[PDB]
Amino acid sequence: QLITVDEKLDITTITGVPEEHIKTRKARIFVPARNNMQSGVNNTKKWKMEFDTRERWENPLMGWASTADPLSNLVLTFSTKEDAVAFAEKNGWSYDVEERKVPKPKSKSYGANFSWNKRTRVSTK
Amino acid sequence: GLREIRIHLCQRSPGSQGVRDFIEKRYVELKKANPDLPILIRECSDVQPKLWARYAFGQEKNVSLNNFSADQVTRALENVLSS
Amino acid sequence: TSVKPIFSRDMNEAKRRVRELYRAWYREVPNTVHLFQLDISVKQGRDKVREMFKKNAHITDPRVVDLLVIKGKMELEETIKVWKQRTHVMRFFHETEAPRPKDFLSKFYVGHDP
Amino acid sequence: PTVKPPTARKFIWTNHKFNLSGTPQQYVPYSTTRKKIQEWVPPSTPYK
Amino acid sequence: SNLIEVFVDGQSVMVEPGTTVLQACEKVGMQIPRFCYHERLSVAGNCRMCLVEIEKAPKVVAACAMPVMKGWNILTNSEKTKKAREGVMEFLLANHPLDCPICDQGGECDLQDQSMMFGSDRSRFLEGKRAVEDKNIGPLVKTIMTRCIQCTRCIRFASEIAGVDDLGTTGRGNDMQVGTYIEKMFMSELSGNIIDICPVGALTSKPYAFTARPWETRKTESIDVMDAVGSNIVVSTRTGEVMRILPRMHEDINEEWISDKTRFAYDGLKRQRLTEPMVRNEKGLLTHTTWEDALSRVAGMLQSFQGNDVAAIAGGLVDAEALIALKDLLNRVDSDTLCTEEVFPTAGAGTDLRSNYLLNTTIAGVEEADVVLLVGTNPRFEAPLFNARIRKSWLHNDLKVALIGSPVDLTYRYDHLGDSPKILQDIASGSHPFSQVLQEAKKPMVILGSSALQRNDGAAILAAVSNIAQKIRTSSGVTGDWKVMNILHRIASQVAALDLGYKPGVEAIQKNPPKMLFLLGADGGCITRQDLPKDCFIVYQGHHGDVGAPIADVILPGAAYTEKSATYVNTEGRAQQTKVAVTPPGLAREDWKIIRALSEIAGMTLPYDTLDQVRNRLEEVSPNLVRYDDVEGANYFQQASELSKLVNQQLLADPLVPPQLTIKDFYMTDSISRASQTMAKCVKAVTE
Amino acid sequence: GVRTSPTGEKVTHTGQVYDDGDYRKVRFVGRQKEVNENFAIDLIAEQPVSQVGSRVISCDGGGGALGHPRVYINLDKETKTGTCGYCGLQFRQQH
Amino acid sequence: RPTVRPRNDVAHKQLSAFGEYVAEILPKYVQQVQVSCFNELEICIHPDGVIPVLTFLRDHSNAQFKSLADLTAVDIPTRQNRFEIVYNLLSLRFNSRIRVKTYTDELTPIESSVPVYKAANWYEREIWDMFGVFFANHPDLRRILTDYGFEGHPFRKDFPLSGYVELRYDDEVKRVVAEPVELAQEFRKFDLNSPWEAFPAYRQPP
Amino acid sequence: VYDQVEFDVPIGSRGDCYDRYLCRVEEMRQSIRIISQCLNKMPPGEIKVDDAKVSPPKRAEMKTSMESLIHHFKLYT
Amino acid sequence: PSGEERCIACKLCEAVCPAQAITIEAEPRADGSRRTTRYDIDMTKCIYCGFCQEACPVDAIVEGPNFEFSTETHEELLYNKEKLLNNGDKWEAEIAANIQADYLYR
Ligand code: SF4
Ligand code: SF4
Ligand code: SF4
Ligand code: SF4
Ligand code: FES
Numbered sequence A: 001q002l003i004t005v006d007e008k009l010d011i012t013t014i015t016g017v018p019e020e021h022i023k024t025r026k027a028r029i030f031v032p033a034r035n036n037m038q039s040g041v042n043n044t045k046k047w048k049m050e051f052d053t054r055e056r057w058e059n060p061l062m063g064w065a066s067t068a069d070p071l072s073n074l075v076l077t078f079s080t081k082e083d084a085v086a087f088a089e090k091n092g093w094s095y096d097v098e099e100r101k102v103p104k105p106k107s108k109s110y111g112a113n114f115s116w117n118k119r120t121r122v123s124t125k
Numbered sequence B: 001g002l003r004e005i006r007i008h009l010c011q012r013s014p015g016s017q018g019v020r021d022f023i024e025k026r027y028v029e030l031k032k033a034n035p036d037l038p039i040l041i042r043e044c045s046d047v048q049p050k051l052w053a054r055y056a057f058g059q060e061k062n063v064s065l066n067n068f069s070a071d072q073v074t075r076a077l078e079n080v081l082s083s
Numbered sequence C: 001t002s003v004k005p006i007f008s009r010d011m012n013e014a015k016r017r018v019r020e021l022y023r024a025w026y027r028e029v030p031n032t033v034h035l036f037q038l039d040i041s042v043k044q045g046r047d048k049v050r051e052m053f054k055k056n057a058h059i060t061d062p063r064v065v066d067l068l069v070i071k072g073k074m075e076l077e078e079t080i081k082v083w084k085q086r087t088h089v090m091r092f093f094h095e096t097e098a099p100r101p102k103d104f105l106s107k108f109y110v111g112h113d114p
Numbered sequence D: 001p002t003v004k005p006p007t008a009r010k011f012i013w014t015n016h017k018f019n020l021s022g023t024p025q026q027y028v029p030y031s032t033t034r035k036k037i038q039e040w041v042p043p044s045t046p047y048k
Numbered sequence E: 001s002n003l004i005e006v007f008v009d010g011q012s013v014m015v016e017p018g019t020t021v022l023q024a025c026e027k028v029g030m031q032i033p034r035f036c037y038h039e040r041l042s043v044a045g046n047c048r049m050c051l052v053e054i055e056k057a058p059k060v061v062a063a064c065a066m067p068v069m070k071g072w073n074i075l076t077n078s079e080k081t082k083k084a085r086e087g088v089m090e091f092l093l094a095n096h097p098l099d100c101p102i103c104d105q106g107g108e109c110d111l112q113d114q115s116m117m118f119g120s121d122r123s124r125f126l127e128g129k130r131a132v133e134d135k136n137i138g139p140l141v142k143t144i145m146t147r148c149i150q151c152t153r154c155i156r157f158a159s160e161i162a163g164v165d166d167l168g169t170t171g172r173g174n175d176m177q178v179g180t181y182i183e184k185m186f187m188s189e190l191s192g193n194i195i196d197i198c199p200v201g202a203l204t205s206k207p208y209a210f211t212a213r214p215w216e217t218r219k220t221e222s223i224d225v226m227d228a229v230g231s232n233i234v235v236s237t238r239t240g241e242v243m244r245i246l247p248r249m250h251e252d253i254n255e256e257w258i259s260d261k262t263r264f265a266y267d268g269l270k271r272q273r274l275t276e277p278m279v280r281n282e283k284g285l286l287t288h289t290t291w292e293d294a295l296s297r298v299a300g301m302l303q304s305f306q307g308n309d310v311a312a313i314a315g316g317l318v319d320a321e322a323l324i325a326l327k328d329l330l331n332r333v334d335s336d337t338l339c340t341e342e343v344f345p346t347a348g349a350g351t352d353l354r355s356n357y358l359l360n361t362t363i364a365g366v367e368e369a370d371v372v373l374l375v376g377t378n379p380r381f382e383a384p385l386f387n388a389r390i391r392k393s394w395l396h397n398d399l400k401v402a403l404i405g406s407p408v409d410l411t412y413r414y415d416h417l418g419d420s421p422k423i424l425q426d427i428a429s430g431s432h433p434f435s436q437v438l439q440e441a442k443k444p445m446v447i448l449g450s451s452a453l454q455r456n457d458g459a460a461i462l463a464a465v466s467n468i469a470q471k472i473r474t475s476s477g478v479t480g481d482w483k484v485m486n487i488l489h490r491i492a493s494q495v496a497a498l499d500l501g502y503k504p505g506v507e508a509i510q511k512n513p514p515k516m517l518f519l520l521g522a523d524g525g526c527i528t529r530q531d532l533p534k535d536c537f538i539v540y541q542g543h544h545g546d547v548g549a550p551i552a553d554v555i556l557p558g559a560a561y562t563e564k565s566a567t568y569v570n571t572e573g574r575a576q577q578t579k580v581a582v583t584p585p586g587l588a589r590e591d592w593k594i595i596r597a598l599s600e601i602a603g604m605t606l607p608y609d610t611l612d613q614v615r616n617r618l619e620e621v622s623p624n625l626v627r628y629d630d631v632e633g634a635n636y637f638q639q640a641s642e643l644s645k646l647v648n649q650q651l652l653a654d655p656l657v658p659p660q661l662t663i664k665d666f667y668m669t670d671s672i673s674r675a676s677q678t679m680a681k682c683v684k685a686v687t688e
Numbered sequence F: 001g002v003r004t005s006p007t008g009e010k011v012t013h014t015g016q017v018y019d020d021g022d023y024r025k026v027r028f029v030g031r032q033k034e035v036n037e038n039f040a041i042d043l044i045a046e047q048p049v050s051q052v053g054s055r056v057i058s059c060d061g062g063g064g065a066l067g068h069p070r071v072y073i074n075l076d077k078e079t080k081t082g083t084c085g086y087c088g089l090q091f092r093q094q095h
Numbered sequence G: 001r002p003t004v005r006p007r008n009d010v011a012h013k014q015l016s017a018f019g020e021y022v023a024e025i026l027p028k029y030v031q032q033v034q035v036s037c038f039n040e041l042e043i044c045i046h047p048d049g050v051i052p053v054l055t056f057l058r059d060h061s062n063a064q065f066k067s068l069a070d071l072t073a074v075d076i077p078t079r080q081n082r083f084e085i086v087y088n089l090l091s092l093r094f095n096s097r098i099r100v101k102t103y104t105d106e107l108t109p110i111e112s113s114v115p116v117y118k119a120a121n122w123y124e125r126e127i128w129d130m131f132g133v134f135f136a137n138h139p140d141l142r143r144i145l146t147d148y149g150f151e152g153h154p155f156r157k158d159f160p161l162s163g164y165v166e167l168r169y170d171d172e173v174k175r176v177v178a179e180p181v182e183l184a185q186e187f188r189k190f191d192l193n194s195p196w197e198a199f200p201a202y203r204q205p206p
Numbered sequence H: 001v002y003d004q005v006e007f008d009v010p011i012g013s014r015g016d017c018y019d020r021y022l023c024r025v026e027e028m029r030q031s032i033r034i035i036s037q038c039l040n041k042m043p044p045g046e047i048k049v050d051d052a053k054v055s056p057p058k059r060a061e062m063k064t065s066m067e068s069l070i071h072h073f074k075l076y077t
Numbered sequence I: 001p002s003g004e005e006r007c008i009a010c011k012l013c014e015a016v017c018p019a020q021a022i023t024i025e026a027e028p029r030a031d032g033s034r035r036t037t038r039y040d041i042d043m044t045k046c047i048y049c050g051f052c053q054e055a056c057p058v059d060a061i062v063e064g065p066n067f068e069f070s071t072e073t074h075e076e077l078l079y080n081k082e083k084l085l086n087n088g089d090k091w092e093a094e095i096a097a098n099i100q101a102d103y104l105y106r
């Protein structure tokens, strides 16, 4: 048998996350920008969720980077922006969504390198 | 007394039509009569038109202008200047 | 909006399970303070139990309430059967954690965290 | 090593040392990098 | 209707005529391997890594250059295509040096990665390798040219994007070499971009050298504040340290480029930093103190002054959250003297109408214009990525560009109308023959530089340029939705401050000198203690000790733009926000929090306690300030033009001379870049 | 190239040394600061420049497969020497 | 071809045929059947079918999957039902293996399979402990791996690697105490994925 | 290569600790039996798959061949 | 053999390290050479797996033959570059001979 439940899906009280790391965090939902050092686009297919960056300090003994943020490395992957938004909602995280940036179609033409009267003529190859 | 006026409105929504008409026809005169009063006009898509009046020591009051006509907008601005 | 229930079919039935769990916890505190040789009073133990229930007062999903009770029963089983040790029981009281500042100014002075 | 001696290098320790833990010659770790952020130094002369 | 059908591995796709095979493939999510092809450069077709089989065609075609014909079936994974890639990869690696461990490209190298995905797994090259001598092209780009694969991306970028024909190929055959032939520095405001486009480690960042590997850096997507273009960037950090700055593609702003200042001034974030609150001691020297003590000193002085006795000046890198917090705080002592260092004429509408001080056409609108009139500006150095967008239009749309001002080099030929501000009246009257160019143009664009408005006759210049844009619309020759008038800002914080209602310039402070002055990152030296009463209490809030700090009574260490999530509005009026890459150093704090904390100690607590709440406040003042990445149009140019005529101010006879005339003036323009050792090397390099 | 600071603490080959007011040097009290005395930067500088009779030489660091990846060094410039990017050995084209 | 794993078409056909066999007999519950290129048969079922489908595979004369090799869960946050429940079964009679998969979310119980396989007892406790999936009618559902009083379910993708609390001995209270976790060296996140596609055969339509 | 070696599987009859003890002892004996065959039937050849996109190349190859160095770099990062 | 460090701060050891026991920082040396300014191994994180010496392209980092280096304090097992270079100078005579005997298997 199925019951009827109309309330918003909320699991904040049964996930075990401490209150400070639910209410004070800010999740960022976005498609990672292409690393401009490379032309590959395979790391721009999926949506991501990261959290706000928090303090890192130098360990007195070694100089290592210490942290007290338990979410500093947490990065989730989602197929769509809707899935990422849904996951943030039920976990109680406030979030910002950035719309995916698509490279717009270019009009490429090799023959334009040799134009008779336009500035697109190249001076070298 | 009065320190600043802000008028928020949309560029396209019909609810801001009266505010749009007021600016188009009567803001120039209002600014001539009030040379040194900041009247910040700030358009933003899909916002409810609103009037903000800031007074001395940071006191602020706002009046909604949704669906007002150009005359009602004048009247709403009439109240603020006297206040 | 049809979902499979856990135990309760609505909030009224879920609330009955909550009150049974609260009664079981309330009655077990005097034994826990004695068996575990705690340095807290029975009042403190029961005040802590009441605090833990209260923070979950806003739930309106009977399924969520069901899970909270399920976990509450497991926590009570670990305590009654002495699977927990003294350290586990006292972890509810954060006795070595110096209070974090709450007002804006105190948090502003010490660091960057909101 | 009396029959196949090790290859000699100038930087190889000529004097072996045994485990020095617990003595004043024990190793003490420390960061080998220099300071990263340089603070602004206010002027020495007065001028407010 | 014009679309034609082609097949990618049997999958049908509809494409516009002229689409290349490579572009047809990406429409079904296939990325053909490439080296020489870049979609923002002219097609070259020389690396041959993009060769692909066409079903029923014996010869493979270069996908990047071959236009796709109707009915073609592109076999992106056939045996012939795979063997073509393996062959080309083999030739690319035959002479390539075994450098990956010492090469900075390692880990983010397109040669490494496409070798792994599309090449063989071993070598059969049994000969010795080519070795090439290195070329010195300045202090920013390191060259290890034995790594070069002769893709000519750098040559094409330099000629096409940067408009500098100093790079080329010398020699022939296997010994063909990329360089300048003669010893010569490639110093351009866009030069650092050849590092990104070079697919190998042939061109690398000199400041970045050897410091990090790509897999270990954390990427923070943020905004540049070195100018008012709002270039989108990524801040690479590792173990709490900023390591480099990279472009982030935003087609409507910086497409995928950044200026050399945006790229390389980050090292100034590690020098001359304010890390602790300071107060003057008995001897009149700044000495470190606690936050409690420093704010108590400021709160006491704040509580004893009212009205015009309190003023504030906002600097060039201030964010909107701090701008409104400071405005709210002085308003609660009934002070309205909230000033910016950068002047904007208050004549007529002033900052009443956003359209008076925005780049109304938008940066992307440049590509739609047919005539551009530049007035009293050098966009090459004021807005390098805006100037690059002009050259793109000049190159591809045959854009006609005219300049009134000094005859600076803009990297493209333009019609110089002169430097006298009188030419504006000639154009408006119709006497000047360029007025006939504007009259015919269907989409003219008149751009006035904010740097010209810093003149005393700025109100006259704005009125004169406004009059021209008014006649162009009176001719009715423009579409209607098209906007003609544009202001080009150079300061990141200027547009947000005008939106919030600040007073442009510091004229008000000079008129009524205050007894207490807040310097919020102000380092322009516009107001000094010579302009203030002898006992003026100066509070400096900022991240660098530069010009403002040494004169302050109290120093409050703020956060730099890499250390806070803060709102900036670019010259178009587009609101963007940064993200925290690293936290502020030492005891430094987020700027809007300092003012919020100060307000509580002074018994004037501001009504917001979190970032979200201060941004709710920003929405109450100017709703567009929280519409991130959106460009909200501004209207009512007619109303502004009517008011601009009400008061007549004469034009000064001085010629219009931009503050930055040559590349040497470009590198240092703010506290961060003035503290950068890299920018100092660039300045030394181009002046010597 | 080991030197001491005004405090007498030895400076490392990476230039590290605690300054006068740094409390962290208390860790060395009653013990010692580990410092390696063979500065590689000075040892490599002592190696002589190798004179070769070709425009391009190769270096693998010596020992064949026990050295480093084999690289080819261009010697066209007479202004300076060709330096191996791996081991620091220097080469010069003769006359 | 020495370096390429050889295919086995005989096993691929047999498993495919048995996959159809199972789906014809239990249409009420089977949602998908697939055989991998290395010849593993997966039955995807509606969660209601757990007991009937497992009972059929254990008891039916052409199945006789008498051994439960493993029972585990996978957390996939992008899915509406984030938890995938996986049963790996072994049939000694037919020298064959089969995998049965279903799904659930945080608040939806799954029927305990202890009645079918007694081996399921501890596996379901482990799934409850590590993932927080509740199994209905379990003879004794409680944590099995985590410390007593441990909060959260560590194997969820959104649970941090180092958790939220760490332990130490405190002399003032003379016991082990739990405190919020601070690390002298933060775990260094690596971005290792190449931006170039590796496997065209798995490309997802755009 | 377990299909290429001969050995017996010890089987118990009572399903108790003593029989499982005997099975383990007998499995040790069969392990020696298998080890004897492995030593005699050990073939020559390479020890890891000759596919440098999976198994790293030999160190000598890594230091001479451009492809090998790339693949070594990528497999270890 | 000249005394120049073999390590070129490529960071392949740090990347492969299964325990993240290696921490490296690097910059151009005064003579322009690519060298580390930090090379730490937390010997209490390390699992002594040898992956670092497999990954190294120049035989710079090795696991040597010494197994008798137990200490009285935890801090003594947090090795920095000076300690590791001293270990190389201390043990090179043996390390080189062991590499000589096994490199043809690598
Ligand atoms: S450019 Fe790429 S392949 Fe060439 S040495 Fe550098 S990392 Fe290796
Ligand atoms: S230097 Fe780089 S971008 Fe220029 S031709 Fe060579 S590989 Fe291409
Ligand atoms: S031996 Fe130690 S330092 Fe080297 S890779 Fe293994 S765990 Fe890391
Ligand atoms: S020890 Fe070897 S692998 Fe590690 S950074 Fe140095 S050269 Fe690279
Ligand atoms: S990418 Fe087509 S030939 Fe270079």
Ligand SMILES: [K+]
Residues within 6 Å of the ligand: E105, E194, E195, E196, E197, E198, E199, E200, E201, E202, E203, E204
């Ligand atoms: K490059």
Ligand SMILES: [Zn+2]
Residues within 6 Å of the ligand: F059, F060, F061, F068, F084, F085, F086, F087, F088, F089
């Ligand atoms: Zn060498």
